[PDB]
Ligand binder design. Structure first.
Ligand SMILES: [Cu+2]
Ligand SMILES: [Cu+2]
Ligand SMILES: [Zn+2]
Ligand SMILES: [Zn+2]
Lengths: 151, 151
């Protein structure tokens, strides 16, 4: 009754660590133990599909595209904050990566429950997340760099 | 009915921006608009006293020492996570500062209410915060670098 989530770099295919998910009275805490990531803030969201495989868009390969879009059980069709309801329930606070490329700063998602997460995918993006679709869609996270399927 | 919190650098005495505090159904969101800070993660907590003045400890000057310790209304006498109850209610998630010395990443404190915050002080530390008293007390935040009194 622990279940940790192994994360794999989409570009190299090599493991980069794990993320521990735990339920508490305020939501789901995400405890990262990752490495080999670019320093800075990274878009971090739960995705619709339980897959980290690639997808295809107009002839281009989309790493981790098989995961689909941001988990949106309320069909909000919008990207926002982890503490706002009119947006993807999968929107989490951005994940911090140290100069040494390590991510260890835990983060909380008050709108989520652990049970509803299994079968979905955990995504880490190259860009950050300003929790808006402006000026860039999906908080500007851009490409997907790391992914893992919540079992 | 807005009330923003002006932050001042303890070492220079010059303003470094403001932090907006807002109440939502999941807690108090802290929206920073700061500058001139050292890149990286910084300990960020609500303090007991409503003052940012200095204090004195065994002959040494403690900038922002007049603010007292971490806000601890339940007398836990312990430092922990923003989503754990047996520790300072004033323990917030660490604040991120970009390479350009700017802090704009909002953060949420699920255990706090806006009303209980007025009259207290907002503190930003030099070191980070691993949300434990080990290996260093108070999450290793160390010295106080920026402070503001919640009006
Ligand atoms: Cu994503
Ligand atoms: Cu503090
Ligand atoms: Zn989203
Ligand atoms: Zn504390």
């Amino acid at each position: 009754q622990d279940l940790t989530v192994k994360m794999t770099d989409l570009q190299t295919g090599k493991p980069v660590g794990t993320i521990e998910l735990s339920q508490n009275k305020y939501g789901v805490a995400f405890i990262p133990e990752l490495a080999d990531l670019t320093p800075g803030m990274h878009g971090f969201h739960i995705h619709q599909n339980g897959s980290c495989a690639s997808s295809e868009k107009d002839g281009k390969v989309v790493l981790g595209g098989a995961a689909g879009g941001h988990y949106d059980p309320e069909h909000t069709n919008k990207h926002g904050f982890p503490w706002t309801d009119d947006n993807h329930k999968g929107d989490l606070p951005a994940l911090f990566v140290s100069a040494n490329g390590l991510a260890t700063n835990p983060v909380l998602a008050p709108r989520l429950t652990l049970k509803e997460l299994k079968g979905h995918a955990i995504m880490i993006h190259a860009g950050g997340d300003n929790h808006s679709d402006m000026p860039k869609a999906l908080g500007g996270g851009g490409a997907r760099v790391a992914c893992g399927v919540i079992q």
